[PDB]
């Protein structure tokens, strides 16, 4: 019997946060906003609670949970060997970045870190998350709030679709600012590795880390709607695809809305952050509409659209080069 409690994103009612914190203490799972996507969270020091997360999501035990912290002091407790990167961290945290470090903490059980010697750590730039973590008094382990294979929840409607009646409490602070999961950068190797593109853009990371490695899986793509997804990187074949795949809805930019019959305008090329903010909602809207095929325009592999394309690639049933 799920409670949905709305809070202001800037100055949330601390009485609501206290209630969430009490649930966390009881080893319960809750859902809460961040600046990236909604999180489904539990006490990071509680094995049995974090196991519930994997179950609710239907997630493989080998995929570790990101551990959310509110301070640099907490970092010192849970990770080691990051001291050379402190300048970097202080430039991007709090913020839409997860970093991989060597695990130090004894309190975070294997289940959270998937038995790995590393820990994924994020300090979220969202007052609700920060205040919740601080008030609760432990780090929170939290992947995105969605059934695995479905698009990451960027608002409470999506969370309800996936989890109503499955968790005691959802904190609603509206649509998430970015709409996309945090950039993940691994810093435990000779050269830093990008494991997931996000709001901290590749171009910016390459400025700070000239030797940044971008593995094949990142460039070549999980996040999927319930109807076959056709991603069209070559927009010359757009004409051909529409006819090939007949029973269709389109997701397209503002600047080409007029070129289609039934089309969700995800956002404009002029403000690509709009596209990122809305892409997952668009996937969820499109699946509900009464069409057999979801057809999505591809975007530049640059800036935030890099991350968008990464997500669309991992979701597509067919890509059209």
Ligand X SMILES: C[C@@H](O)[C@H](N)C(=O)O
Q: Which residues bind ligand X (CB under 6 A)?
A: 34, 36-37, 39, 66, 98, 122, 124, 142-144, 181-182
Rg of the chain (C-alpha set): 20
Is 223 annotated to bind a ligand? Reply is yes
Alpha-carbon span 256 to 235, nearest angstrom: 11
Number of residue whose CB is nearest ligand X: 39
Is 144 annotated to bind a ligand? Reply is yes
Nearest to ligand X of 33, 298 (CB atom): 33
Q: From the CB of 64, what's the least distance to ligand X, in Å? A: 11
Closest CA to 114 of 184, 63, 79: 63
Nearest to ligand X of 127, 143 (CB atom): 143
Neighbouring residues of 95: CB distance < 8 A, sequence distance ≥ 6: 35, 123, 124, 125, 199, 200
Alpha-carbon span 304 to 180, nearest angstrom: 9
Nearest to ligand X of 161, 254 (CB atom): 161
Q: From the CB of 167, what's the least distance to ligand X, in Å? A: 14
Evaluate the CA torsion angle 251, 257, 263, 266 in order and state its sign: positive
Is 276 annotated to bind a ligand? Reply is no
Is 176 annotated to bind a ligand? Reply is no
Is 59 annotated to bind a ligand? Reply is yes
Q: Distance from first CA to last CA of the chain, Å, rounded?
A: 46
Neighbouring residues of 85: CB distance < 8 A, sequence distance ≥ 6: 99, 187
DSSP secondary structure of 172-238: E--S-SS-SPPEEEE-SSSS-EEEE--SS-HHHHHHH-TT-B--HHHHT-----SS-EEEES-TTSH
Alpha-carbon span 319 to 317, nearest angstrom: 7
Alpha-carbon span 139 to 132, nearest angstrom: 10
Q: From the CB of 10, what's the least distance to ligand X, in Å? A: 18
Nearest to ligand X of 38, 245 (CB atom): 38
Q: From the CB of 40, what's the least distance to ligand X, in Å? A: 8
Is 71 annotated to bind a ligand? Reply is no
Nearest to ligand X of 20, 242 (CB atom): 20
Q: From the CB of 163, what's the least distance to ligand X, in Å? A: 14
Nearest to ligand X of 187, 294 (CB atom): 187
Alpha-carbon span 262 to 282, nearest angstrom: 13
Nearest to ligand X of 67, 224 (CB atom): 67
Q: From the CB of 237, what's the least distance to ligand X, in Å? A: 33
Number of H helices, E strands in the chain: 12, 16
Is 25 annotated to bind a ligand? Reply is no
**178, 303 in Cβ contact below 8 A?**
no
Q: From the CB of 79, what's the least distance to ligand X, in Å? A: 16
Is 82 annotated to bind a ligand? Reply is no
Is 153 annotated to bind a ligand? Reply is no
Alpha-carbon span 33 to 144, nearest angstrom: 10
Give the residue ranges of the annotated binding site for L-threonine. 36, 68, 122, 142, 182
Binding-site annotation, residues for ATP = 59, 63, 118, 144, 152, 196, 223
Please enumerate, by residue number, every residue annotated as part of a binding site. Answer: 36, 59, 63, 68, 118, 122, 142, 144, 152, 182, 196, 223
């Amino acid at each position: 019997s799920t409670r949905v409690l709305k809070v202001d994103p800037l100055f949330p009612d601390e009485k609501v946060l206290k209630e969430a914190a009490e649930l966390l203490r009881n080893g319960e799972v809750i859902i809460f906003p961040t600046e990236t996507v909604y999180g489904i969270g539990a006490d990071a020091y509680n094995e049995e609670a974090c196991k519930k997360i994997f179950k609710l999501k239907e997630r493989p035990a080998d995929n570790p949970l990101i551990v959310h912290i509110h301070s640099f002091k907490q970092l010192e407790e849970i990770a080691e060997g990051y001291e050379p990167h402190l300048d970097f961290l202080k430039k991007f945290w709090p913020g839409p970045l997860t970093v991989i470090f060597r695990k130090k903490s004894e309190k975070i059980p294997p289940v959270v870190t998937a038995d790995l010697p590393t820990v994924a750590v994020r300090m979220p730039a969202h007052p609700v998350a920060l205040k919740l973590i601080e008030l609760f008094g432990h780090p929170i382990a939290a992947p995105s709030a969605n059934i695995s294979g479905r698009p990451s929840a960027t608002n409470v409607k999506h969370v309800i679709e996936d989890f109503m009646g499955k968790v005691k409490l959802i904190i609603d602070a509206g649509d998430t600012p970015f709409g996309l999961e945090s950039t993940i950068v691994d810093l435990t190797k000779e050269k830093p590795v990008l494991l997931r593109p996000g709001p901290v853009e590749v171009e910016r990371l390459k400025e700070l880390f000239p030797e940044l490695v971008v593995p094949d899986f990142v460039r070549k793509g999980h996040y999927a709607p319930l109807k076959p997804l056709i991603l069209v990187e070559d927009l010359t074949k757009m004409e051909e695809v529409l006819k090939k795949y007949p029973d269709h809805v389109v997701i397209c930019v503002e600047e080409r809305k007029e070129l289609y019959d039934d089309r969700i305008v995800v956002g404009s090329l002029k403000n690509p952050y709009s596209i990122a903010q809305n892409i997952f909602s668009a996937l969820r809207e499109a699946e509900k509409m009464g069409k057999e095929y979801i057809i999505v325009e591809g975007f530049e592999e640059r800036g935030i659209l890099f991350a968008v394309m990464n997500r669309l690639r991992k979701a597509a049933t067919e890509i059209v080069r």
